């Protein structure tokens, strides 16, 4: 929603979460699969030099 | 409304601009910030993870 202003003491105003407008959904992160796969493949290729 | 998987309501009383009387406020806090102080089986007596 917003920074709901709640006042404590003489002048201190802290900001806390109000409601949630709409439906709730997950907070996520997205990484491409083929780029991550051949990135791990290249990391394994390079690290196989140090382990025979 | 409905049910949020991560947010508790956590209504608390707080000090107004005068010391004598108290007022009731509310927010919505996240689940990993809220700890159940409990010496019994009480499911509504919660506190912040700060004050320890």
């Amino acid at each position, epitope marked *: 929603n917003t920074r709901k202003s709640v006042r404590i003491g003489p002048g201190q105003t802290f900001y806390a979460t109000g409601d949630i*407008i*709409g*439906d*709730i*959904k*997950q907070a*996520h992160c997205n990484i491409s699969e083929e780029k991550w796969n051949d990135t791990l493949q290249k990391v394994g290729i390079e690290l196989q030099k140090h382990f025979p | *409304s*409905g*049910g949020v998987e991560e947010m508790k309501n956590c209504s608390f009383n707080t000090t107004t601009e005068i010391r004598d009387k108290e007022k009731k406020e509310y927010a919505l806090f996240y689940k990993p910030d809220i700890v159940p102080l409990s010496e019994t089986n009480n499911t509504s007596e919660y506190r912040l993870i700060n004050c320890n």
Partner: antibody
Amino acid sequence: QVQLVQSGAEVKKPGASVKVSCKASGYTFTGYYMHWVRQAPGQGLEWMGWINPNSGGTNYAQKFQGRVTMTRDTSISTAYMELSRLRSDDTAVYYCARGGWISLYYDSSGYPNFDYWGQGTLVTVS
Amino acid sequence: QSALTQPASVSGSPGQSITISCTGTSSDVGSYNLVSWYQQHPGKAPKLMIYEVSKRPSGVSNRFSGSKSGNTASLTISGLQAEDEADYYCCSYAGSSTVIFGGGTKLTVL
């Protein structure tokens, strides 16, 4: 195929409460939103809020203020409206429509994409 | 925050291009691209005819084209027959998870 059926026509008195049902058949109803619209006879269309059949989340339009409650059950695949404090202005026809797709990663509630509708219940008051 | 403005009725000969437009504020049409259009026969349930702003659904002949320009969204129909006599409505994403429907037109054939 995909069908939406509702209850019969209901005649009531002012100040009472009306209940309109809507049964969804042909698809998994727990993955789609369901919106409710209102049609007065001879007027346009008015929109009431949506119901999420998974977690029971609701929204409502303005000038209603929680005087209508929408609930659902996952056993018989039927959505429910409980509208209270009836008035002579509320003589209309109520439709239930299928909305967007529940996706767990973005808010698809406000998407005005209504494909399938019920045949509608006529609610008249004296 | 009322309904979207809409003409009361339209008229047109068969084979004549007819344009229907509805106007909204900056928070309804000018900021979100979710503007759909519905028709209904009198006495029957409404039916979807246009997706988000310009896409056509399945089972629909390529005759209804929708477009938007600023705060105005318009639907253009060419090649009209007697089966297009219906009531046409606008809708949009109004923000804060709310949907506002349009006033509605009536199409008269000649």
